[PDB]
Design a protein around this ligand. Sequence first.
Ligand code: HEC
Ligand code: HEC
Ligand code: HEC
Ligand code: HEC
Ligand code: HEC
Ligand code: HEC
Ligand code: HEC
Ligand code: HEC
Ligand code: HEC
Ligand code: HEC
Ligand code: HEC
Ligand code: HEC
Ligand code: HEC
Ligand code: HEC
Ligand SMILES: [Ca+2]
Ligand SMILES: [Ca+2]
Ligand SMILES: [Ca+2]
Ligand SMILES: [Ca+2]
Ligand code: NA
Ligand code: NA
Lengths: 520, 520, 75, 74
Amino acid sequence: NLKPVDAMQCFDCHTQIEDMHTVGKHATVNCVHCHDATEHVETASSRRMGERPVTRMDLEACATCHTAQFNSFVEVRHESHPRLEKATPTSRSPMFDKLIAGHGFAFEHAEPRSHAFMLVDHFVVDRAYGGRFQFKNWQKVTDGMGAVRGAWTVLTDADPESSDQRRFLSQTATAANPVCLNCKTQDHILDWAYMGDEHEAAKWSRTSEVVEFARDLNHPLNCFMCHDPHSAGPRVVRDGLINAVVDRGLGTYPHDPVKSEQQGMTKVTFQRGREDFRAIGLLDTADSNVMCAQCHVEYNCNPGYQLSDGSRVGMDDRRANHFFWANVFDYKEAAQEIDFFDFRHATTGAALPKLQHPEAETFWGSVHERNGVACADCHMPKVQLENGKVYTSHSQRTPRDMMGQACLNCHAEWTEDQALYAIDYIKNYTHGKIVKSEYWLAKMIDLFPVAKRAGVSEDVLNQARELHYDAHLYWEWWTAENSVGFHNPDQARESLMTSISKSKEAVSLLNDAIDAQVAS
Amino acid sequence: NLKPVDAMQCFDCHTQIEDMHTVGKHATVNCVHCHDATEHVETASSRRMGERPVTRMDLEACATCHTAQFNSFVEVRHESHPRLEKATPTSRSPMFDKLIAGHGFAFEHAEPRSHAFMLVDHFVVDRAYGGRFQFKNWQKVTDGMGAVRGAWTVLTDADPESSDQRRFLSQTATAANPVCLNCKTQDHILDWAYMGDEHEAAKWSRTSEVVEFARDLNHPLNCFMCHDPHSAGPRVVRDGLINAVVDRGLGTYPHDPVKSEQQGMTKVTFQRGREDFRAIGLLDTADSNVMCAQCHVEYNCNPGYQLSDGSRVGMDDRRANHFFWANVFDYKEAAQEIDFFDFRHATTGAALPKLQHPEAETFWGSVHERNGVACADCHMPKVQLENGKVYTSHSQRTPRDMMGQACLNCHAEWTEDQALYAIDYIKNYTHGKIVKSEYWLAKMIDLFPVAKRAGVSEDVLNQARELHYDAHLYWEWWTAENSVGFHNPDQARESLMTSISKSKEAVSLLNDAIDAQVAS
Amino acid sequence: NLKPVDAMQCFDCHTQIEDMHTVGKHATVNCVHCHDATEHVETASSRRMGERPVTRMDLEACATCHTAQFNSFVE
Amino acid sequence: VACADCHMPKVQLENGKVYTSHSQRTPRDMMGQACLNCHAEWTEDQALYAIDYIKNYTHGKIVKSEYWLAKMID
Ligand code: HEC
Ligand code: HEC
Ligand code: HEC
Ligand code: HEC
Ligand code: HEC
Ligand code: HEC
Ligand code: HEC
Ligand code: HEC
Ligand code: HEC
Ligand code: HEC
Ligand code: HEC
Ligand code: HEC
Ligand code: HEC
Ligand code: HEC
Ligand SMILES: [Ca+2]
Ligand SMILES: [Ca+2]
Ligand SMILES: [Ca+2]
Ligand SMILES: [Ca+2]
Ligand code: NA
Ligand code: NA
């Protein structure tokens, strides 16, 4: 059985923790629930760690006292189709392969499924580790609880003796790097310096061998990514987000300084050897928009290239761990700001951005956001009980599964069918515009080989390539973003119309140029 | 009312039948249930047939004593979408037309539906008889029982006065030949010599006019295709399968000689005029894998061409009735073995195989097969009754309709939702790889006209054509095979990755060559 | 917010509770969850109760850490 | 077997930390956990039928007991 330790003794050296722990709603929660610090206490000095204490990162460390939130979190939504490739005609991006050609996502980009699987899914996706990691067998793909208990209880490593990224299956890529992990797990929260910068106290950084790093990681979406385990207060731990909101002074709501101030973030730094090591962001309120923005944002988490001169930006560069913290219409400017793009299109040669699930940045300025609605309101609402102690659902899922709590309490004028219809109206419309944007992107892309081969000049090709950047941006945001427009219908519509415009302009440029080459 | 005949009198001339009938569980079943042999008995000698007895091939000949299995067999699964074309974006092969161009399946290839309709569906599909046979009206498409009772109770013939294969509708083909029928019906089991070889005692052979042959045929999937009507013992009657397993010594489980020996096949031959005429394969066990392999395999049942010199292989050639009895990774070698391919791709000019529903060969070596699971376990399991005499379901259908009996008895760790999720994980993943393989096939195929027109050399074109064979093989197996990977997920994945690799290599070959032609 | 009390001090007079508490699965659960003993501790000796400490009998005292059992119970 | 087995059984979760239900109620509401895990030979309806056979029979004897008690009392 657990035996409590003397927290006062800890507090003599751990004044930051004391200040947090003694004041919050974990004041009575003994350190032994999450730390085995016996050898540590025997060996540490006021500034030297001595023996490293054991810190539990497993979610069951919170499940003993918070079973309801734990069981609700680990629930698997079987209706969320698993391993479902987005580049298929019945999914999000029917022409994805043509449009993303040149990028590692061509190897596999599946729809998201339940949070329990984020880490294992990160490990086994075809684009990530050369196929090195696989479920032990195809039965394990169902095991949400197992995945939560640890990725390595359900996965195998094709070659435990090597640690290099390489291809074990022919049609895989090795795009995983250590930055990715920060949106999958925070098991490494004590082993990773802020931003993944080199640091004498960090086991792991942006430049680590990601395969070795992966082997050290177990748990998806740790409960403490949103809840400080010492104060039990709301926080974020994602470096990239703290960096955008606080270091870069952009605010939690970059479009709204008042709301930014009311619902702010305070960066708290923890040191190793009296050097800054890691940081968390304590939230003024339990603001799920910002909690979810730890991961549901457009980011760099990868090497790239400079827009200016095309030189490699490696993992060693800060820009490999970056939250643009910009909506779709400020994105190009934000990418220019850091002088960065992701890949050159394999057919057009255009330098292109790669967009990632920008739900947070899409949600800004939308009607629900302006009305003070947050992600949790639609995606993890309070449970309604005829008789019971209320708690917040932690099953982050479509509102379709809980329409009464997620929509209809606020929308009393609607039945469930009407609320669903309103969603489908926006998604249907938006998806039609996505598909039309892809049609036009594909039409332009197919003209590039024709133009090159007809001898169209590099100047025209480059003009078309510059158009491709925008056509691509204003389309890809929306296949990347998971609400199919619902989070911001007007913005989706304007963006997708811009994409089609850009592609149409490029098509007409390329067609005329080809025709002039043929007539000459 | 039926009157029994003296079986002893039959047995005086029919010693093989006597040996089978007197020992099995049909020992008390009088010949009159299936034979009207009165004139026959008056006219036959010990070696000459005399007057041909009537033999009932209808399934109702078994339904009198086996109603439960009969009614379960004729059940129509309305949820199995009928006449649903596979070459559509919402079905199995969104780019099928481009990829199969040159082949008669371009005219129509629908998803399979319930067994009751196999014969009528064979007759009316657009690729088979030039549209000569149609349901009498569009209402008849529902009538499973009618179809079972006889194709000609529900179909019409556009021109009863001619017997040539020709087109009555513009966009049809005439690919049907007599070999096809062997996987639709065995009404002709006494009129067809083994393998469809010419034989003085055969009304029908590989070279018959298939329209005349078709008119003689009524019943789908006769009950006796798996059950010897004399011994009631398990058997196969499909010549092509007996030929692979026994004549060619490949075994019932070509990858497993031990299992092949334990679950073997004994070829029994029946003679006409003391010449070998027809054959059946008696099974050591009631092994549904091998029963279902009568039809659910990759086969030749058509004319083709030789890989070596491109000369026609006609219906007269044995190779027109062939079971390759090879998995996807041994297939090319098996096709080389008989020096055969199906069609030249209409755009690339590549010689290509045409793959048919290879469920049996896919299933080999899969985890379920290695554990001794068989088709019937998932697709026609025993019925569970609170109170009743157990019998085997004969409704051969997706396990989704009976998950408790088809999966969950064996998978006690799963709920139905979890079992379904595991299936969908594999199918989603596999289908994404199918779609990616088609993307790459299509990209390569589209380069062929560009390459030819840019003056790329025949040597390079032929190199690309050789790549096309493999790209095609390693893709088509999986749109042909009906489990969308479920029967063998690892093999689907490796094959589809091989297909994409092959296509990518061909694309790069063709692109470089085109570019060099343009630069010159 | 609950402030933990010094359980060891309670245990100086409460050896029978000490033997049960330090050993079971509530060894880390502070007395403050179920007792308000501030004035008790100011006035008691080992042989004189002093001010009667408050003991919580409400089921919510357990519900903060065992919500699932509590909610299942109250259905 | 103990009361809890039929009246307060462990909750079965596809994914989750198991705990003991504290809703003390008839097994009819949770036959899978309260009876069928032990009685794998039965469907829910069969288990319910076995309960009702006993309850119906016993209630008949309760009613007859009352009939006779009432007759004596009168
Ligand atoms: C003698 C002083 C001292 C004592 C007492 C002390 N610590 Fe530490 N501890 C340190 C120092 C120094 C570090 C390194 C970080 C820092 O410098 O603040 C550290 C680091 C840690 C870490 C981070 C370890 C990691 O992997 O990065 C944890 C967790 C921790 N302490 C917990 C505890 C607990 C729980 C107690 C009481 C059981 C305790 N400490 C008592 C000095 C102390
Ligand atoms: C409910 C779980 C839990 C409780 C209880 C808990 N900790 Fe922690 N602690 C964590 C986790 C998880 C981390 C990793 C850093 C983070 O999440 O911010 C951590 C990190 C730390 C660190 C490292 C801060 C740094 O320098 O990076 C110290 C020191 C620490 N804890 C001390 C304590 C002390 C002292 C107590 C007893 C008062 C305690 N913790 C109780 C979970 C817990
Ligand atoms: C030993 C019991 C215990 C442990 C273990 C535990 N908690 Fe708590 N937690 C509590 C108690 C007690 C409260 C306060 C209940 C109340 O008064 O509302 C609480 C409150 C919270 C709150 C409420 C914050 C608020 O202001 O409403 C959050 C969030 C929370 N815990 C998260 C966690 C996390 C995350 C973990 C794992 C890192 C964890 N807890 C582990 C006992 C525990
Ligand atoms: C800024 C946080 C963040 C970064 C960093 C991150 N992801 Fe993700 N990831 C997400 C979110 C949010 C989802 C679910 C939404 C979605 O997929 O659109 C997701 C989903 C996934 C999935 C499931 C869906 C799919 O695409 O197949 C995989 C696999 C994945 N990520 C792999 C990676 C890889 C590999 C990297 C590093 C190259 C990475 N992630 C980096 C936030 C992140
Ligand atoms: C993605 C961020 C996030 C993560 C990770 C997270 N929570 Fe929460 N949690 C929330 C939000 C949002 C609330 C509701 C805050 C509010 O509105 O008061 C909440 C509330 C809570 C509370 C307060 C009581 C309640 O239910 O409202 C507890 C306790 C809690 N969570 C425990 C956990 C546990 C245990 C885990 C790990 C299984 C976890 N949380 C992970 C976002 C998160
Ligand atoms: C339940 C139906 C049924 C029963 C009863 C039955 N038969 Fe048959 N018989 C068939 C069918 C169907 C065929 C076609 C060949 C086959 O299925 O193997 C056949 C074929 C034959 C043949 C042809 C074998 C050959 O040379 O090709 C003979 C002879 C024969 N039956 C004799 C008998 C005799 C004698 C009896 C009485 C003991 C009998 N059958 C009872 C159904 C039946
Ligand atoms: C006049 C009644 C009758 C006829 C007609 C009939 N059967 Fe049977 N069948 C039986 C009887 C009786 C048994 C043995 C029942 C038992 O003992 O299990 C049997 C057994 C079987 C078995 C069981 C084999 C085994 O070893 O379990 C199969 C398969 C079978 N019949 C198929 C057929 C087929 C196919 C037909 C039509 C070709 C047919 N029967 C027609 C009466 C009939
Ligand atoms: C008011 C009477 C009536 C209505 C209502 C009706 N039907 Fe019919 N339907 C007929 C008649 C009469 C025929 C032709 C019958 C015949 O000649 O055998 C027919 C023919 C058909 C056919 C064959 C068409 C063809 O081209 O051969 C189909 C399929 C069919 N009906 C389906 C339906 C469907 C489905 C509905 C409901 C959507 C429907 N019918 C409603 C009377 C009706
Ligand atoms: C080796 C046995 C076999 C051969 C011979 C055979 N089929 Fe099939 N057929 C099947 C099986 C098994 C299915 C159901 C599985 C599937 O369609 O993928 C099927 C399904 C069909 C269907 C329904 C699905 C569709 O494709 O529209 C048609 C029509 C059909 N076959 C026609 C033909 C034609 C025409 C021939 C001769 C050129 C032929 N079959 C030869 C085994 C066979
Ligand atoms: C595709 C091959 C196949 C066909 C065709 C077939 N069966 Fe069966 N049959 C089986 C299998 C497999 C079993 C179960 C054998 C076992 O496991 O004992 C079976 C079992 C039987 C039995 C034994 C009792 C039982 O239900 O388990 C009878 C009787 C029977 N079938 C009758 C029929 C009838 C009548 C037909 C025509 C309606 C038919 N069979 C067609 C495969 C077939
Ligand atoms: C007659 C017993 C039985 C049947 C019925 C059965 N399974 Fe299995 N299945 C097994 C066994 C044994 C394994 C391997 C177990 C192991 O090695 O861990 C397995 C493995 C699997 C796997 C992993 C396959 C792989 O390649 O790793 C999946 C997925 C699966 N089963 C799903 C199903 C589905 C879905 C059904 C119903 C359609 C089903 N099973 C029916 C016994 C069965
Ligand atoms: C989770 C609730 C809870 C916790 C924590 C708790 N108590 Fe109690 N305590 C009770 C309840 C309820 C009673 C009433 C008697 C009973 O339930 O046995 C009680 C009774 C007592 C009594 C009276 C025993 C008697 O003589 O009848 C003492 C002394 C006591 N507790 C001391 C403590 C001490 C000291 C602590 C801190 C280590 C503590 N308790 C922690 C709930 C709690
Ligand atoms: C501050 C949080 C907290 C409070 C308040 C709390 N408990 Fe617990 N309880 C725990 C923890 C932690 C465990 C140990 C979990 C584990 O390790 O299994 C536990 C364990 C238990 C167990 C399982 C004991 C065993 O031996 O299996 C029971 C029963 C229990 N508590 C009842 C209660 C009761 C009744 C109350 C109200 C009088 C209560 N708890 C209040 C945290 C709490
Ligand atoms: C009528 C007696 C009874 C009462 C009253 C009761 N429990 Fe339980 N409790 C049980 C039983 C029985 C178990 C299961 C013991 C076992 O098999 O391990 C249990 C188990 C537990 C456990 C251990 C974890 C688990 O769920 O198995 C906790 C914690 C718990 N109860 C909390 C509570 C809370 C909180 C209350 C007040 C709402 C409560 N109990 C009231 C009988 C009771
Ligand atoms: Ca999803
Ligand atoms: Ca990006
Ligand atoms: Ca079907
Ligand atoms: Ca074939
Ligand atoms: Na969802
Ligand atoms: Na089916």
